Write a protein that binds this ligand. Structure first.
Ligand code: HEM
Ligand code: HEM
Ligand SMILES: Cc1cc(N)nc(C[C@@H]2CNC[C@@H]2OCCNCC(F)(F)c2ccccc2Cl)c1
Ligand SMILES: Cc1cc(N)nc(C[C@@H]2CNC[C@@H]2OCCNCC(F)(F)c2ccccc2Cl)c1
Ligand SMILES: C[C@H](O)[C@H](O)[C@H]1CNc2nc(N)[nH]c(=O)c2N1
Ligand SMILES: C[C@H](O)[C@H](O)[C@H]1CNc2nc(N)[nH]c(=O)c2N1
Ligand SMILES: [Zn+2]
Lengths: 411, 409
């Protein structure tokens, strides 16, 4: 079967066949679309087909499908599963697997970069201290003094689900948030609960507006342990504006390295519950979401005050005006400090070229329009006008619940 | 089976039960989501279940479900379908149906207004000239000297499908487009094909940038005929900016009345193929989409230049700056001329209030996030953070194919 998508700006029509390899469910049915819903232990029996599907894809990718090396590897993995109930990936398979999970990430606008990913194999790690060291090395490598390089570090896979490796932080680098007795928040309101956990585990909080959180690291199902990332490894950018010299005295800064650490990587039916990965920011993440969401740093009003905008009616579009200036400031600041960043026009134009390439080469590119379209200026980017098909390919990155909800405390 | 939606800004969680009454298909399957796809006669047998479903909801709404008058109406309609192969709605049913088709329009941010809709019953209309008269009256009533009022005008229902009433125009009021020897497009690029069909049918095109198109009306399945809307009934707004005095010199204007005329209204299985309806604009429709789409009037570059922004690199956000100013000018011009308009902040705020009302007293509100979130400044409006479930309820408005593909001359 064939599915077509149309671009309403260019009239370019693409044909998807790749969706035929989709397996997992979307949440949608013929009666209900759940496209805007954010969130819509394996047996030997379920595992071997998953392993086989993966190895088939890997061996096809290297043009060795059906070879003796292919057949011997299927055999070897089958025998490993029957005997030990799981199996180990070869390094080459792990690399291919991590790159493909990114390639298949339908919510990622940055996927033009998918084949350039440094994979750090941390499967020999056994303790939280070992995790800390791996993560420091990742941060220093990825940061590269501002010349950011994509990377992922992969800790040992799930076994019985009682021995999971987990990074409790949602991102490797994030600022603390502190709920005040008067109900106001100091720092990042998104991180209040997690900050509270760190404090309870014995973190001495500075209680400022941009305090880098400690890592809380769980190895082998053990209770997590706290570690401070060396501050010299945490590259930050003070935010200033090219024309407005008062912008600096807002006292804003942000960190250069966006590094998601709470997702689960599935390759061939194996589950890597700790697999922190990093790239570089698109500016709107910081300037639109982190700074301007009402339940984040929420700076729109203060910015618009300083610009002397008419604030008595929303129809002056004061919020939109202040939003654009904050985003100019984030891009200018990163660029001035030589820290990699991409603007939303750049990024979406590159995404459309990536997607067209994938359609030709691969027969499709699953994409989640709700996430791919930037949170400002949506329709002046080419992705707004592009129809997309969202479906689930493996290998994949998946959301998993926060570990504090599920962890069995050892004490 | 019962589904939850969460607002990620406010943590408010709502439970949707209304979706269990959805009938039509979404285009999504368990394997593929088609959320971003723009486009994803009835026999006696098919028609009675549809009539019954509708009449049940109707009698329910007036608190007379299972009453003698309920059973008596179901009886009458059944008899009428068996004998005539169709049936006629009572005026009360027609009004209820049209208001609910709007209530059910999952792509409409303006539904807080749904119960305030003036319904013009044009089911007695028989000719294209009659259609023109009804439409001018709609246009004049809805416009109301700039104090716009929501309205729909409903022409006769489909019969055997060879006698369709159709307004060939996509909206009652739109601007002509003409491809130039220059290679460029003069006017609205979106209307090139329709403008050509107009000329072919005899329209004397002025060949300007903002020429109000004539109506092309089809009655009783006949060949469509041309009429032009009295110029004094088409309220237009010249676009200026509260601070940039050069803005007026771009020569921009837009019309005050948005009036969709190409959709099909389905009520109780009955199909109203000509049912033009109108409300009032949300500013971004004109300022973001009409003015700044590549493929529309595409004015971003000209504005940016007059602002003397750095257009050398995308990262100066020159497009975004110019976008906001164009949208400030649209809103300012409509407000100064006392023509009803709503900004995207205010409209989305009232949709959230509407959603909560609908969850509270109906068990849900079908909504298409891809359409509800404005085409600029998405995440600084409250709808961006609101999970929505999209499903199809009847009565409904449905897209239908351009009739020039359908029609046999
Ligand atoms: C290289 C530069 C990259 C850019 C500019 C980029 C851009 C983005 C953006 C803007 C988002 C949405 C973020 C949000 O709203 O929270 C995203 C999502 C995502 N990206 Fe990327 N990306 C990059 C690299 C990567 C890498 C290296 C990976 C993994 C190997 C990755 C995998 C993902 C995944 C799984 C999501 C969905 C996250 C979620 O569900 O929270 N991306 N990307
Ligand atoms: C009262 C003021 C109204 C406002 C501010 C409003 C707002 C909007 C907006 C912004 C859209 C998206 C349009 C687009 O992007 O092309 C829309 C779509 C729509 N609205 Fe409304 N609306 C109003 C009245 C109405 C009325 C009176 C009806 C029917 C009686 C209606 C039914 C629809 C339908 C069916 C769509 C989807 C149209 C399509 O698929 O092209 N709306 N609404
Ligand atoms: C409920 C929920 C579900 C889900 N799947 N993800 C989230 C995370 C939510 C989704 N938007 C905010 C929060 O993520 C912030 C992280 N963004 C940074 C980045 F990693 F995505 C990234 C961005 C740019 C370049 C590279 C990278 Cl690795 C929340
Ligand atoms: C392929 C296609 C499918 C579809 N369902 N609709 C369209 C119409 C396409 C989709 N966006 C543009 C075009 O409509 C412009 C009409 N907008 C005016 C209005 F009616 F929507 C309206 C707006 C504001 C207030 C009231 C009203 Cl009644 C195209
Ligand atoms: C409810 C809705 O799905 C939610 O707010 C989404 C919308 N689109 C998004 N897009 C991106 N890139 N990141 C997000 O966090 C979200 N949030
Ligand atoms: C492909 C995508 O669905 C398309 O560009 C949509 C996106 N959202 C929209 N939203 C509204 N309100 N109107 C539109 O015309 C569109 N176009
Ligand atoms: Zn869907």
């Amino acid at each position: 079967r064939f599915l077509k998508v149309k671009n309403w700006e260019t009239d370019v029509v693409l044909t998807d066949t790749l969706h035929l390899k989709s397996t997992l469910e979307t949440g949608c049915t013929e009666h209900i679309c759940m496209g805007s819903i954010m969130l819509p232990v394996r047996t030997k029996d379920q595992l071997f087909p998953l392993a086989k599907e993966f190895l088939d894809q890997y061996y096809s990718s290297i043009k060795r499908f059906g070879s003796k090396a292919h057949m011997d590897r299927l055999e070897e993995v089958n025998k490993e599963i029957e005997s030990t109930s799981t199996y180990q990936l070869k390094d080459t398979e792990l690399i291919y697997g991590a790159k493909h999970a990114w390639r298949n990430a339908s919510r990622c606008v940055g996927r033009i970069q998918w084949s350039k990913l440094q994979v750090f194999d941390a499967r020999d790690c056994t303790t939280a201290h070992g995790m800390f060291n791996y993560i420091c090395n990742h941060v220093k490598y990825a940061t590269n003094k501002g010349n950011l390089r994509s990377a992922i570090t992969i800790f040992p896979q799930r076994t019985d689900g009682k021995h999971d490796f987990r990074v409790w932080n949602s991102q490797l680098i994030r600022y603390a948030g502190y709920k005040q007795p008067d109900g106001s928040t100091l720092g990042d309101p998104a991180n209040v609960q997690f900050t509270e956990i760190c404090i309870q585990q014995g973190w001495k909080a500075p209680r400022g507006r941009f305090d880098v959180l400690p890592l809380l690291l769980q190895a082998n199902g053990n209770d997590p342990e706290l570690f401070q990332i060396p501050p010299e490894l945490v590259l930050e950018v003070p935010i200033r504006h090219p024309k407005f010299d008062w912008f600096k005295d807002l006292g804003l800064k942000w960190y250069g390295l966006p590094a998601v650490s709470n997702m689960l990587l599935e390759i061939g039916g194996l589950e890597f519950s700790a697999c922190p990965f990093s790239g570089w920011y698109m500016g709107t993440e910081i300037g639109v979401r982190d700074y301007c969401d009402n339940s984040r740093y929420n700076i729109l009003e203060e910015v618009a005050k300083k610009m002397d905008l008419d604030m008595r009616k929303t129809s002056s579009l004061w919020k939109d005006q202040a939003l654009v200036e904050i985003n100019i400031a984030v891009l200018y600041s990163f660029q001035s400090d030589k820290v990699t960043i991409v603007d939303h026009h750049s990024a979406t134009e590159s995404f459309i070229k990536h997607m067209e390439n994938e359609y030709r080469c691969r027969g499709g590119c699953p994409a989640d329009w709700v996430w791919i379209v930037p949170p400002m200026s949506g329709s002046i980017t080419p992705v707004f006008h592009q129809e997309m098909l969202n479906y689930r390919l493996t290998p994949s990155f998946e959301y998993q619940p926060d570990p504090w909800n599920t962890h069995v405390w050892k004490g």
